[PDB]
C-alpha cells in the first residue's frame, strides 16, 4: 500500500509504476532507527528500511540544477543502455569470454553534459536510458563537500562498530532515469542504501535462493548477476526460478535500506517517476569467527562455491575448463 | 592368441576361460626388459608386460604345500565373498555411509587353515570364494625370507631410481581361487605386478576414461572403485560406459605387468585355472615438478577432482553434503 505524502500532497506512487514479475514477494519492514526490532534485523543480517536516520539529510535538497551549480567541473562516469535493463560487467574478466557482447557502454563526461544529454533524450523520443554512477567525496565542489560532511556519520559509524564491520569501502552517488532497472545480483559487502530523490522499488532475495537465481560462472564478466531475464524467465534452463520468493519495498527520500551481505537485490526506478538520486554506503563485512560454528550460513556456502570455482580456474590454467571438469565430477557420481 | 607353453605342453589357456564383457580391448605389449620400447612405455607411464625380469624367480616354485611348510605359524588376512566379485572397502569410511552393506567379510587365520578352508570348498560345492592378501617380509618363515631376498632387487631398484619414484610402500602376496574377480579400480601408487602361479587376465583403462567408469564418491568406502557392474552395466545411470576401451593381457608365471599410477585395472583369475599366486610391488610416484607444465595430464585432473571432493567434505563438515552442493554449483550454470 503506497504511503501518503504529508500535507495531503497525494500518494507518493501507485502500483501502475511498478513492473510486473512472475514471483510472489512480501514487504520489507519500515521501522524507526530507535526501534529495537530494527537493530535485531540488522544484527541478524536481514533487510530493513529505516525511516528516520537523517543519514543524508543535507542531500535531500539535491536535484540536477543544484548538483550542476555545485558538484564541480570534474568528470563523472555515465553508463548507457538502449533498454531499461542496465547490463553491468567486469572489464577485467572479458578475456575469459570473447563471445560476450557488452550491452551497456560507459562514457566519462562533465556533469553539465550528463544533464544536457539527459535533457536531450527527454525532448526527443527516449528509448535510450542513462545512469550516473560516481564515487562521492572525490574532486567535488565545496558546497557538496559541506553536504557530504553533514551526513549522519554518528549513526552509521555506530552501526559499523556494533556489527563489527570493516571499513567504509565506497560512497557511491547514483542518478538514474525513470524506469531504469539494475537486474538482480548480489554483493559481497554490506550496504546502507540511502534514498534522496524519487522512488526505487527494491526486491531482495536471501542467499539461500542461490539455487533459484542461477548466477553466472564466477569467471564470467557478469559474475554475481542472475542469468534469469525477470521479464521473460526461461523455465526450461532455470526451472527453480518458479520457486523464487522476494522481499519487496519502495524507498523514497529520507529512507535507508539495509541490503545485507550476499542478499540478491533487483532495483528499479519507478516508471514515470522522474529521476532518482541515491547514495550507497558500502562496508566490508565483519571477519569470520575463529571457530566456524556449524551449521553454515547460506552465504558461507556461497563463499565456498565461489572459492571452488576460482580454485579450479587457477589449477586448470583456464576458466573455460571449469564447467567440463565439474560435470565430469558429478555425472553419474553425485547426481 | 594364447601362448604355447614350452616342451609342447599345450596352450597355457584358452578363450573359454575368460569372462565376457561389453567393451572392446587391445593388447598390452609383451616385451623383454632389455627392449628400449619397454623403458619408453614405463617412462611414459603406459602399461607393459615384461617377460624376463626374473623379478620373483625364487617364488616360481611356490604352491600351497610349499608355503604351508615354510611360511610360518603366523596369521594371514583372508577375504571372503559369496560371488566371484570381491567387494573391497575402506572400513575407516563406513561411518559416512551407514546404508553401505559389506559384501565381502575378512577373517584372520593361520595359513594351514586357509589351505583347509580352500580345500574344503573344493570337496564341497563352492559358490563361496576366497582371497589371501597379506603383506610380505613380515613374520615369515626363514625359507620364504630366503626366496624373498632372492627377488631381482637389482632390476626393480634401478626402475625405482630411473623413474624417480618414492619408496617401496608395500609388498603384497595374493593367493586366489579360480574365477576370482577384483573389480575395476585405480590406485594412487605405481605397481609392478609379478605373476607366480596360474593366470590372471588384466584389463586396464587409462586415467582419461574417468568419465566412462564412474568411481564412487571419494568419501564412500568404495572410493577409487568403479560403480559399474561389468557383468550387467546400467547404461541409463552410466551411459559413457558404452564408450570404454580397455588394454588387455593375460599374465602367467614369470611375467611382470606395470600398472601405472591412476590406471584403472580389472583383474580376474582364469576360470578353471586353479589357484593364482601373485606378488605386487607398490611404489610412491615421483613428486610433482616445481613448474606445473600445461596441459595437465589426465591423472592430475583426477587428483584435482579428488582434492575438491575432500575439501568440500571438510568445509561443509559433512561428506553427505558434497553432492547437493556440487549440483547447486553446476545446475543451470555450467551444464
Ligand atoms: O549500483 C548498485 C545498486 N543500486 C542502488 C540503487 N540503484 N542501484 C545496488 N548495488 N549496486 C552495485 C553497483 C556496482 N558497480 C560498481 C562499479 O561500477 C558500476 C556499479 N557493483 C555492485 N553493486
Ligand atoms: O589387490 C590388488 C590387485 N591385484 C593384483 C592381482 N590381483 N589383484 C591390484 N591392485 N590391488 C589393490 C589391493 C588393495 N588392498 C590393500 C588392502 O587390503 C585389501 C587390498 N588396494 C589397492 N589395490
Ligand atoms: Zn549491488
Ligand atoms: Zn589396485
Author numbering:
A (entry chain A), B (entry chain A): 15 to 349
Question: How does the study describe this entry?
Answer:
The transcriptional activity of the HIFs is regulated in an oxygen dependent manner by 2-oxoglutarate (2OG) and ferrous iron dependent oxygenases which catalyze the post-translational hydroxylation of HIF-α subunits. Two proline-residues, Pro402 and Pro564 in human HIF-1α, in the N- and C-terminal regions of the oxygen-dependent degradation domains, termed NODD and CODD, respectively, of HIF-α isoforms are efficiently hydroxylated by the HIF prolyl hydroxylases (PHDs or EGLNs) under normoxic conditions. In a second 2OG oxygenase-mediated mechanism of HIF regulation, factor inhibiting HIF (FIH) regulates HIF transcriptional activity via 2OG dependent hydroxylation of an asparagine-residue in the C-terminal transcriptional activation domain (CTAD) of HIF-α isoforms; such reaction reduces binding of HIF to transcriptional co-activator proteins (CBP/p300), which are histone lysine acetyltransferases. Here we report studies that inform on the activities, mechanisms of action, and selectivities of the PHD inhibitors (and related compounds) in clinical trials for anaemia treatment, i.e. Vadadustat from Akebia Therapeutics currently in phase III, FG-4592 from FibroGen in phase III, GSK1278863 from GlaxoSmithKline in phase III, and Molidustat from Bayer in phase II.
R8J, has the same tricyclic core as Molidustat and coordinates the metal in PHD via the nitrogens of its pyrazolone ring (trans to Asp-315) and pyridine (trans to His-374) ring; its triazole ring is positioned to from electrostatic interactions with the 2OG binding residue Arg-383, i.e. the triazole ring of Molidustat occupies the same site as the glycinamide side chain of FG-4592/FG-2216. Surprisingly, analysis of Molidustat complexed with FIH (for which it is a poor inhibitor) reveals that the nitrogen of its pyrimidine ring is positioned to ligate to the metal trans to the distal histidine, as do R8J and 2OG in binding to PHD2 and not trans to the proximal histidine, as observed for FIH-2OG binding. Thus, the binding mode of Molidustat to FIH might in this respect reflect that of Molidustat to PHD2. A model of the PHD2.Mn.Molidustat complex based on overlay of FIH.Zn.Molidustat and PHD.Mn.R8J structures indicates that the Molidustat morpholine ring may not completely block substrate binding, consistent with NMR studies (see below). In the deacetoxycephalosporin-C synthase (DAOCS) subfamily, of which the PHDs are members, the 2OG C-1 carboxylate (normally) coordinates trans to the distal (i.e. C-terminal) iron-chelating histidine, whereas for Jumonji C (JmjC) subfamily members (of which FIH is a member) it is (normally) trans to the proximal (i.e. N-terminal) histidine of the HxD···H motif.
